């Protein structure tokens, strides 16, 4: 197995920091390395494995559709596509009844941005500092982290950033020339920072007052992650365009930009498109993913386990912890120092896999099927590494 | 089945011209609609089904990996990724040994543009008129078609376009401020127009002389579509970055940008990324697709049937036919009048699905395993619809 690891390290572009281990299988919230070591996975492909590694229903839907049909364009209707369309819009506010399927989050946001420009006829985009929307140049233009943008300038203009949760800043920034505002209900990479009701209420109200669109990026908060089907169900606002991805396909690359009908209608024929977007394989996985989510009301586990996990985390007596925050099973532990060293030790010393969300924050995005025995061990592991 | 069709038509964003039918299954170069009618598929998901609908090896690879592991990020090595990396680089010239896996053709070019700027420190992109590179804003900036770019400007700048196959024009445009040239060995959407040896050689030489990077877009011409493994093999040149997608995963959403070592090396850690890019499921499918392509040397069927197929089309006694062109099984039939109605007749009266490549061109992108007897049927169908 060491030849595959070394081949991956060698042939990779090098843009990633690859860990010294090879993960070969996964079931539920557990994964195994090539040596047989079993880990608690709080990474879950960056919030993709919400339904759990090896989810039976999704795996089955994938196997069956793979035998039937995988390549069929948007110009040629295919049953699983219509089924995904009606299954996803049925668990959403009736205003969001138009779907543009894609293959990633960045493509979902790229779709939202384009649909927003064609509909308003405006150009400006307003986003929040510490926000992440994707790496493709369109989505990168509204992604804050200067490190990620500077090297590739100039990007798409004009874009304006405002502090997250700053009601007045958002109010001043949104004008008659703003095509749309794009925000995460809970900032992910930005450090697991929940939006305030006042902030999202202001975003909704002012975008309407100015004729601008509101794009809510729930690529990471979606599919039960925050304790509710979708984070927005926590605040009581309905955006003009909703973008989803990650867990939407239960593992299969899948994304979607759901929008109001008058928004979709403004897009000229052939104004946008995608080869893989809407393909039967992803569509089938999507139907399965959503059907599992709804039958099991999976967001509940995050709603019950989230607070429970965060409480135990808080109880950890270490002066290195500044704050424990999050919503449901989207948790962040902010330290008063670099988190990277502790993430490496959780993996090798405790077989616990975690993420970062800024250099001093440890982020947890475990599958929502994860049990309490596993969450408790993660806690103990964190406590042990911090001591 | 009608319920599912109306649901797709109604809930779709509406940016597509959806045909009046519902395709439920496929096998080889044939597909069936929900009524049981069988069609000869020359669309193939827009050149995705190169290996044929239902390819045993790919379908099987998908089933096995789906039960094993589907969600695992780039920071955590996984066997199928290392396998894909070496399997893909092994079928390419030595120089192309660094891989950045993605989820679509547009993401592949988006990565190519970003790596180019990072490596050269330059900003300018040079593309060809009638060229197509994708719908995300980055790739859209280098895509000609005004009706597609215009409504979304301003986009990524600066971008200069030159006439396809114009040697002197390309030379005058590529200078010490050019980050990269991006070209298709054979323009797809632009009407199936092959590059000439002089033009591509010119591109390779002038980019080297000026310190600019050469990006060859084989998202459409790749995987044995033009008669050889990759279209550049017919021209005797090695690009600096090769972008692929479409048939690369045998149906599963997959794309990639393969580049020379010094190019990848210039990219800052974390300078680019993607959630789904490089996931085990797409990697496993990618491995199976390549092994199949190599075992059968599938491009040979394209090289043999292509020329034969084109001669047959040119011999059709119809004054409406202007010219036939293409390479392997990437064929374009140019008519002296709108093609749309003949594509509708082909579908309804002969159950032959075909594409367009401009308003006056009928484009054919059938699985490479299509039977010679079926292409004859296609030629016959064309001769009848043009009567
Ligand atoms: C809110 C959000 N929006 C858009 C994206 C982009 O979508 P996609 O094209 O499918 O990556 C991501 C990835 N953020 C995760 C991964 C980023 C990375 O690759 O690093 C994460 O923050 O862990 C997001 O967290
Ligand atoms: C050369 C080429 N490059 C990049 C892309 C972008 O890849 P993707 O992001 O996966 O679509 C395509 C799709 N072009 C076909 C489909 C466009 C459409 O949606 O229609 C086409 O040639 O019509 C290409 O033909």
Description:
The structure is a homodimer of 387-residue chains. Chain A has 387 residues and is α/β, with parallel strands linked by helices. The first copy, chain A, folds into two domains: 1-54 and 297-387, Aspartate Aminotransferase, domain 1, CATH 3.90.1150.10; 55-296, Type I PLP-dependent aspartate aminotransferase-like (Major domain) (Aspartate Aminotransferase, domain 2). In chain A, 39% of the residues lie in helices and 19% in strands. Chain A has helices spanning 2-11, 44-47, 56-68, 79-89, 105-120, 137-140, 146-149, 167-173, 197-210, 232-235, 261-265, 280-296, 299-315, 340-350, 372-386; strands at 23-27, 30-33, 38-41, 96-102, 124-128, 159-162, 178-183, 186-187, 193-194, 213-217, 241-244, 255-260, 321-327, 330-335, 352-353, 355-356, 361-364. In chain A, strands 4-12-11-10-7-5-6 form a seven-stranded mixed sheet, with helices on both faces. A four-stranded mixed sheet of chain A has the order 1-2-3-15. In chain A, helix 3 packs antiparallel against helix 12 and helix 4 packs parallel to helix 12 (280-296). The first copy, chain A, is globular and about 55 Å long. The first copy, chain A, starts with a helix and ends with a helix. Chains A and B meet through helix 1, strand 1, helix 2, helix 3 and helix 4 of A and helix 1, strand 1, helix 2, helix 3 and helix 4 of B. One ligand PPE sits between chains B (46, 104-106, 109, 132-134, 184, 188-189, 217, 219-220, 245) and A (273-276). The PDB classes it as transferase. The entry lists the keywords aminotransferase, PLP, RIKEN Structural Genomics/Proteomics Initiative, rsgi, Structural Genomics, transferase.
